[PDB]
Amino acid sequence: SRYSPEFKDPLIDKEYYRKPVEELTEEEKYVRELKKTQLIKAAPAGKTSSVFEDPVISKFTNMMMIGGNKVLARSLMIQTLEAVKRKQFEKYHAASAEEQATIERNPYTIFHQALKNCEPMIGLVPILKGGRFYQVPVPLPDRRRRFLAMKWMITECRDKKHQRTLMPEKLSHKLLEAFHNQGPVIKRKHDLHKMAEANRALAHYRWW
Amino acid sequence: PTSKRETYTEDFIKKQIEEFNIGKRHLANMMGEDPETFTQEDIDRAIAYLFPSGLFEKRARPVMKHPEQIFPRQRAIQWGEDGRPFHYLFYTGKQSYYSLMHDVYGMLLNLEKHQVIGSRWLIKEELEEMLVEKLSDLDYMQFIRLLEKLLTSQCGAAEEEFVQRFRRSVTLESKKQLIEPVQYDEQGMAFSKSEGKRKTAKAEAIVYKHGSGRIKVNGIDYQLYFPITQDREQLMFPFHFVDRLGKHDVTCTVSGGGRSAQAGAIRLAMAKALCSFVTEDEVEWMRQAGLLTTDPRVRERKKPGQEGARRKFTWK
Amino acid sequence: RQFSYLIENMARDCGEYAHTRYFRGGMLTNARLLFGPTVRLPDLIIFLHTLNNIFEPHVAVRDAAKMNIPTVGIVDTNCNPCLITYPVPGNDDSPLAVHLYCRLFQTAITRAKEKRQQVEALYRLQGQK
Amino acid sequence: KNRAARVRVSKGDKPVTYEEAHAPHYIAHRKGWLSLHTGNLDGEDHAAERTVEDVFLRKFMWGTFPGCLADQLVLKRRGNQLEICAVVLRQLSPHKYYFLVGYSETLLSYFYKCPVRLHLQTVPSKVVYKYL
């Protein structure tokens, strides 16, 4: 790293600084003065102080990018958001008066919830006991299950079963199926849940 | 034995003091100066002209200094003709270090009987110069533990002077951005000019005090110059943070680098020039947000035996 | 350590040398290198405590015998007086005794130093006339 | 391990010179250059012909002043002129030094068609920087 350990990460939160001094707690007040002395890193290009910034949609864009082509990864994400937006408007005008109250049209609320319906609770880790590897169920951490949800959605879409379908139409179709708890990505979570509950007899091999 | 440590006595150093004084009057005759008012800075300037050396090491270049700054301080003879050591702690090996611990421990006993920012404790390397004695790390810590113990107690006025000697000073540079001088153009509009740098991109930004939020990069509207939204987001960031969008007119000229290197360089220039039209408190928030710091991340060089900067050729 | 301050002061008071600190191996058996070739070692070592902090004989007891230096020592009931030339058997722990030894050795030494200046002055004065 | 222009450590009885005590990675940090011309500058030419003259001159002086050279030569070029600067021992008689100066100056001036001047600096004994 070209930054020294002295350099601290910057805080882009715009509503934090505005906080009145009257609300500042004694511990928080101290921190603010301390940061003045500290050196701060330059904010990276990815994150700004905009009101539309979403850390989950920026991380999902970085996990699809290939070779630093972020203009294409971001383009696919926005096309997908617009495809989810246009498909729900088409399902809202053709719905009954009482069916329109249960139709979500915000593509973000769909993206965050669909990824939450794919997060597994427990995973399988190979442990070496008696010169053999056993896939014992282990509790996945919060980050791990948030990462697996994104990786599986991108692997399913990348999978070469759909012969000639553009990513925005594929990613949009999988996000709407996981929103209703359907599709292979959800099924892939169940298959990992069915193998962790069948091999619960080997839940003592692990130590941590 | 052929290798002997170069020992310099007082008589040898006394003859070196006379050659420098005479050489100091000769060097002033060469340059045509007055010998009396010929300081050491002029000697360093005259020796760098008469003996020009481009050696990167400044300790390997010609130097004509006073013998007290060249020759190191040496432990003087520690006994008379009879052979009795002057000091009573000679046989300890560290008579200077132990005489100081004996004095500090003696002042801590008197206290019982009758009963800060900008300063740092003398470093180990600086404490071996006051005593002319080699000191281990552990011995230095022991000495610091007694001084701190001295401070906690209700030390008298004299003791404060004693401790102060071992407390060196550190000049801390206030982490405050340098405001640019507001200028005025022919029409009378106020503005501030600053410069930025990102990778290989260099940018100059002029920020007018009053404007309608119009930005011209190299004479072209920013949206035309920057098609990618991300680049435009970087331009907005400084102004959005200080909640003053659509209030200034910017005229910048960026050269070098690429698409994303040019925006970063402009962001930093605008941000620095926008600190003159905001309060001191807002400038500190910009600093804590990473808007006034120059990103030092630049491309790393490739090494002769590797595929890349850090990537290695495949191990067979 | 309890009497380290007291001994160092008395040594200064009586114009003599002290070493109440950690004995670096070689002070005596290696003085030429550590101090120099023309160094003069002690002619008499007075041990007020013949043991170290791990209840074992001080290394200087044996190092002074190798350099044929006469030693004086205050040996207690758990001390070794075999290499000590003049051993005084007494308590070496109580502070009321160590103050006596220091007061006695400091007085006997100061007297002799003042006794020679009287014998020399008489000899020098008598010699002149 | 790297070997170039390095004097390996010894018991301490080996005396080395300043130039001999520094390795190649100090050539521009603690050392200068023994030859100074323009051949190797950007846009200059005849770098291969100034080099051959240096290799021969150092050998001509080593065999013409045998046992008398305390340190390496410092070759200097200013236009047509070539200046050889040398540190030599005082063992040899001065009469023989003046002979070798007029013989080497003249011979090398007719061989390289240039004015050659040689500047000797006698020293009692080989200056020692440290003992490796």
Added chain:
Amino acid sequence: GKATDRMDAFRKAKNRAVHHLHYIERYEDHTIFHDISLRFKRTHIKMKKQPKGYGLRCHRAIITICRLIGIKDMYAKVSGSINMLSLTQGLFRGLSRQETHQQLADKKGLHVVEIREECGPLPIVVASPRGPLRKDPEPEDEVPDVKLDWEDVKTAQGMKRSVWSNLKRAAT
């Protein structure tokens, strides 16, 4: 002396030997005061006091040391392990712990008289006590309970057959 070069080991050993010197007492400056028979570890050295002209008839190393000490006449036999270091460390130990005739007189407060066949029955006083001479003689013992050496008893009774003893050799 220990070093990597053999010439460096000679200096260390040579210069350190003058700081670990012994003083060996000599009877009439040519021999030991009495028969010494010690054992260092596993090495046995049995020295014997001999008259002038006998020479050194001992282990070759003992002959080197004795010349250094100044002992012209002495007989020694080495048994057990012939380790040079135990023979050297054991010889100096026995040669420094030998009691002189003056000490013997002071210890017992009596006269030490030397009897020689060449001088017949004449009694020669070699040492006398500085302190009070004892008026009572040492109680005579009919038989002394002293441990003997079979090698010496076997020689005096003419039984020690050896084709290597008392062989003609060079002057030592």
Added chain:
RNA sequence: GAUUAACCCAAGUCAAUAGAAGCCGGCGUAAAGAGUGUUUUAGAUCACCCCCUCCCCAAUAAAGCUAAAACUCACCUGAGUUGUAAAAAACUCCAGUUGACACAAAAUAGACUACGAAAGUGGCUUUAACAUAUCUGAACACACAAUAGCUAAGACCCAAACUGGGAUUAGAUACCCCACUAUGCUUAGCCCUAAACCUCAACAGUUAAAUCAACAAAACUGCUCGCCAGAACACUACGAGCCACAGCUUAAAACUCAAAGGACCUGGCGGUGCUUCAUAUCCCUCUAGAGGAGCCUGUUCUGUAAUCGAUAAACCCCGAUCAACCUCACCACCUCUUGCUCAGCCUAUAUACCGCCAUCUUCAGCAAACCCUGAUGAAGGCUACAAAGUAAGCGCAAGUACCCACGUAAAGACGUUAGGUCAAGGUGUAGCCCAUGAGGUGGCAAGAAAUGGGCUACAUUUUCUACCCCAGAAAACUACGAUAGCCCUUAUGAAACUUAAGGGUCGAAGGUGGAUUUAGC
């Protein structure tokens, strides 16, 4: 071995052989206290004086007894029980509760330290009962002696050699699972062994002196008995004796070697322990890849009349920042001879070397000179409320370079691998000298196969075009995809199917890659 010189003895020399010098030392581990006790003939002086742990805790033998667990049977219930790193086999009148029920074996106490000659003895009770008023005293006398084992007759819960079955394994006459027997138990006889080792004889005594090779369980004295004298052959052979008949006891030699052995030190290693770690690292975890296809390229095999070198990590687009001729050292043919050189050699040896490097090093050591310890052995050398270490010098570090203090370069000691290179050049030694030298002409350097590295791809986050980021087309047998093949032209050059570029034709495999594996904060 020859030659020269020298050394020793000398009318002798000195090869083979034989002989001459052999007991007062030892026995914890080197060869020796032979399993135990008693006595005899005798010896000793520790026997009178003169004195201090009787009895009781797990001695022994006999008879009797039984608390816990188990087996078995019966009832009731259930449908399985066993086995384990994980399985199979086995069993299914099986399993669980309850109750009844031993010729087996004896938790806790026992953190005790006792009895007995030793072996050995640890549940309860009772009887008998535990030699000796000096010591010593036996391979064989006399009497005992764990386990195993024999013979005979009983018993039988469990365990269990053998055996059988199941599994593992390259194999498995083994380790793991199951079942079962001899045997372990009782009675009566035999056998007579042990790492029967507290490897440290019995009795009496001492703690001073030289404490004492080492280690272990401090070192000695008196007295006596027993044993032992290089290793191995040899717990053998023969002989004798024995209820022993594949046995035990006692116990040699020949051949053979010049060592074996005991106890330490250092270092290395360990499918060695603890603890703490690894940040691109050991493993998992993140990302792009490799191995799959084609091409390029190197190597190995094969081939050819037709180089050399590197070649586990640390070789393999390595020497070469480079081979059409030249380079060139190779092959075939021809030619020259003081030869471009006061010659020459790309001849052998890198295991003679300099020189330049690799590697551990993505280390932190290295070391002169002293000192001390260990009884002056190889060896070793710290404790900060400090206990023998001090240290110039080399390195690291620091400085420097590049965009700073960061990071990256560079640097990186001593050593290791007789690591690499005599073909950079030089060079020691041995070798060739009408040829192992020099020159000319022509020529080969391929590909059944295998392998390493790389390039391009298998497409839709793509293809083509315009633009350089608000587009329009394409899109599976005229798609994606060759830098290959074939043909032509051009460029360089004296010389090009041959090298490179371009165009045209052609439109293959391939559809995401097994085992494994690389790099990166």
